[PDB]
Design goal:
part of a larger assembly; 4 chains; A mainly beta (about 120); B alpha+beta (about 90); C mainly alpha (about 80); D mainly beta (about 80); A: about 120 residues; mainly beta; Ribosomal Protein L14; 5-stranded antiparallel β-sheet; D: about 80 residues; two-stranded antiparallel ribbon; RNA-binding; structural constituent of ribosome (chain D); ribonucleoprotein (chain D)
RNA sequence: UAGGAGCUAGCCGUCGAAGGUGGGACAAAUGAUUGGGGUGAAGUCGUAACAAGGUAGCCGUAUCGGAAGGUGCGGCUGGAU
RNA sequence: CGGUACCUAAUCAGAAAGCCACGGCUAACUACGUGCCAGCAGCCGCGGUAAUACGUAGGUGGCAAGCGUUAUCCGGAAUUA
RNA sequence: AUGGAGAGUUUGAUCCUGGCUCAGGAUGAACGCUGGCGGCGUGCCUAAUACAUGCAAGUCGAGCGAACGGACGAGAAGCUUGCUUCUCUGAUGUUAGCGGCGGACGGGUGAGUAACACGUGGAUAACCUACCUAUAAGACUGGGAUAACUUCGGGAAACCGGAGCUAAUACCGGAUAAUAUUUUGAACCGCAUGGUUCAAAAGUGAAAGACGGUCUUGCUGUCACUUAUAGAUGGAUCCGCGCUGCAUUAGCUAGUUGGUAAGGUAACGGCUUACCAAGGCAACGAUGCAUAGCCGACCUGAGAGGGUGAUCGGCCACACUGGAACUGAGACACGGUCCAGACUCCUACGGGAGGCAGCAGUAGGGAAUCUUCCGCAAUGGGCGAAAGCCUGACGGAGCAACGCC
RNA sequence: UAAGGAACUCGGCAAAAUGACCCCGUAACUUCGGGAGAAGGGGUGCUCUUUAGGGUUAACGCCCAGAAGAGCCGCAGUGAA
């Protein structure tokens, strides 16, 4: 279950360290979201140095929720935390040394870029 | 390291070489077996051997080595091939 | 000058440093079990006054010696001669 | 065929082969050359309580194959 | 079966640059911030001290002072009357 | 590196010289637009209807591949004992 | 010992003190009109900025399974009549590589570098030495393998995957001829620690190829092979000095203070451990901070003598950072593995690494460093008989009152 | 009660979380008393070994332990309150 007013981690090297959410865009009245989606958020802890610094508005994309998913396979993928990653109105991220695992359900997301940028993908 | 060093010297084209055979582990500029004389062996006069001719007993019996031109001029001096006569003695 | 210096390092160390557990493991396992038993004035107590002093020209011709306990380890054993 | 045999003065006590040296010598200057007293020491501990503590001795303390006294001893001489 | 002892396959503790945490230190911008001097006509003040600077007084010294200046108690000459 | 050096001499009175100023000390001349203005301006200047001096000038001065500076040490100045 | 005005050196000026632009020189030099020529010497300061790398270290079938091709003979013509389409030699050459190699140095940098880091001088009972000289053995050797040679799929990829297999100058199964090996009595020296006295038991192989004319081995000469000795050579441990300077840095330190027993350095130790005193260290400013490759180097005060590293020379340390191990005799390696790290590129995702401190220039800059300069021409050396390369060592080509002649 | 974690709300009311004991560590500011339980950490099961005791000591024994390891089990060891 993901909602706004929720603390999300990053897994890139842009200059952020932790964020939380303002919104879950989409449609009028849209509440919640999971992996494969675009959000806005703001940084309550920034990495010293880096581009993106604390107290700043940002967009981002979902990865590897603990509300993992189930596919047309009839089968399931879960994690033990969540994380986000920050973008540049282009499906192009700022930090470019992505850590940790990521899903496969974002090729459709057209972050194939990011997937090639990624470690192991699932 | 170790052959008879025809060592670079001097100002613009003043290659005033020196009789030497550098150490088995040192460079052309470094330490040596022993410096044996002050002459350019490529002198326009001749090989022109002026060395410590009495030192043929030490560096030839331990370590030193000529190269293809001065083994001749040393034993028409009575050193290099003549040290073979000394070893036979 | 980038070359293949990295690929045969292992197999030349397997012709030398693994021969140093082919001929040497007779010492490596001995220091734990076999020589540890031949010591202690045991059933085979100190039989190298004559064993080594016959075999070390013959076949027992090892080359890992140094000093300053009585040897590195063992060469001081022709005491009874 | 000879080595360091200086003279000094013992200080402290314990097992294992004293002599805990304190040599006195001179050191001087450039423009005016005032050669004047200074010292240098080498600590160790008592011989067998043979080295009397406070002993202006011909000093050194034998070659080290363990860990308390430094180098080539000569002979204990005089008490101070 | 090396199975005994063994090392790799397995377990009991080590540091390791690394890695990231934490409080101080230095800074640098400086903050609708902020103290010392100088500086550039000194318009601010009398030429305040230098002719007892118009009244010799002074030195430590309560004292207030936008600024030349002033009043209290212990040593003094660095003074014309 | 050299059909270049050595050489014929081919060659002809030929094919090769600027400084602050023209200021007392700056030796470079007095002048004008110059009237403490412009501005050259090193110790210091000049300049106010008689500028030598600002600007300019033909020469022009101290040496010449010459002309003045910039960071270092010291002469200067043992003004570092 | 040979140097030496200050244009001046305050006030009303007379005078003392004072410090003082400046004018002279040189400088890694450099800033503001190019000339007769030439010549010197030199060389990224900023830019130890990232570094692209090119190229940056290569030498030996004169080691052999030699594979390959292939010399040479080269059946038979395969007949628009000239092949080794054949016999065996299959030499020489990448040799398939297996092996002897170095590669830290010719090359670079001074990052760092508190103490012999070096300058610079000692004592050493603190000795070992692929490449090396000389006196003593021959050129006895396991060849399992081993690429030789074959076999099994994958992904663009990185680069792997399973199955077997010959030679060597590889090395290795078994005996050997050189202080070999450390004990019985054998000496004293620097007490510790050396001194070989004893008798050598103990060293023990091999590398034979290319092989000269021949004796095809003498010594297998070569240039590659096994065994004591020393030694060149280098490094090698123990003391003084600069081995640090500096309290608006002071009280410093706790197996501590570095012998005995176990361990280990060619040597030797608290290097760890069972014992030793709180001791030891001290305003010798220890502690700690700052700093450090070190000397000459130059200029130069009258002499006194000194500050002097850019260069330039010598002597340390580091070579993408770091960490473990391997190692070449020694390596943490200018052009070695695993790596973290870091980014770089690639990605077809399956993962792989790269890797400027050789020397040029690339972005850059500057006042400054030439020119992604020339070639090994010569000399140089590492491996290699012979011969070869590295050359970005070397020498040179341009640069220039930086300074002149 | 998943998951998220004060967005609810006038307002974290409420509830939630804390706690026991042991050990280590606890700043600021101070009317010097304190603050301070500051904070912040870490720990507790069972068995065999003595360690050697608190002695339960009569003494190892009796339990707690001197409190030392070594071991057994589970998601879980002031397992409740």
């Amino acid at each position: 279950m993901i909602q706004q007013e929720t603390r999300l981690k990053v897994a890139d090297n842009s200059g952020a360290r932790e964020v939380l959410t303002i919104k879950v865009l989409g449609g009028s009245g849209r509440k919640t979201a999971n992996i494969g989606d675009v959000i806005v958020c703001t940084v309550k802890n920034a990495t010293p140095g880096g581009v993106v610094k604390k107290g700043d508005v940002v967009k981002a994309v979902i990865v590897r929720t603990k509300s993992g998913v189930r596919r047309n396979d009839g089968s399931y993928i879960k994690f033990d935390e969540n994380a986000c990653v920050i973008i540049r109105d282009d499906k192009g991220p700022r930090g470019t040394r992505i850590f940790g695992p990521v899903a496969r359900e974002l090729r459709e997301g057209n972050f194939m870029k990011i997937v090639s940028l990624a470690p192991e993908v699932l | 390291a170790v052959k008879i060093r025809l060592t670079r010297l001097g100002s613009k084209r003043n290659p005033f070489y020196r009789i030497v055979v550098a150490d088995a582990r040192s460079p052309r500029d470094g330490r040596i077996i022993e410096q044996i004389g002050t002459y350019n062996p490529t002198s326009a006069n001749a090989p022109e051997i002026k060395v410590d001719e009495a030192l043929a007993l030490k560096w030839l019996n331990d370590g030193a080595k000529p190269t293809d031109t001065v083994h001749n001029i040393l034993s028409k001096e009575g050193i290099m091939k003549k040290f073979d006569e000394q070893k036979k003695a | 000058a980038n070359i293949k210096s990295a690929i045969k390092r292992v197999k030349t160390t397997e012709k030398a440093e693994a021969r140093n557990i082919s001929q040497k493991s007779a010492m490596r396992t001995a220091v734990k079990n076999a020589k540890t038993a031949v010591s202690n004035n045991a059933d085979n107590k100190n039989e190298l006054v004559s064993l080594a002093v016959k075999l070390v020209d013959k076949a027992a011709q090892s080359n890992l010696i140094h000093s300053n306990k009585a040897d590195r380890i063992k060469s001081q054993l022709m005491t009874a001669n | 065929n000879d080595r360091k045999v200086y003279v000094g003065k013992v200080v402290s006590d314990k097992m294992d082969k004293t002599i805990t040296v304190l040599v006195e010598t001179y050191k001087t200057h450039k423009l005016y050359g005032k050669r004047v007293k200074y010292s240098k020491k080498y600590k160790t501990h008592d011989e067998n309580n043979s080295a009397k503590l406070g002993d202006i001795v011909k000093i050194q303390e034998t070659r080290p194959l363990s860990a308390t006294k430094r180098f080539r001893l000569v002979e204990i001489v005089e008490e101070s």
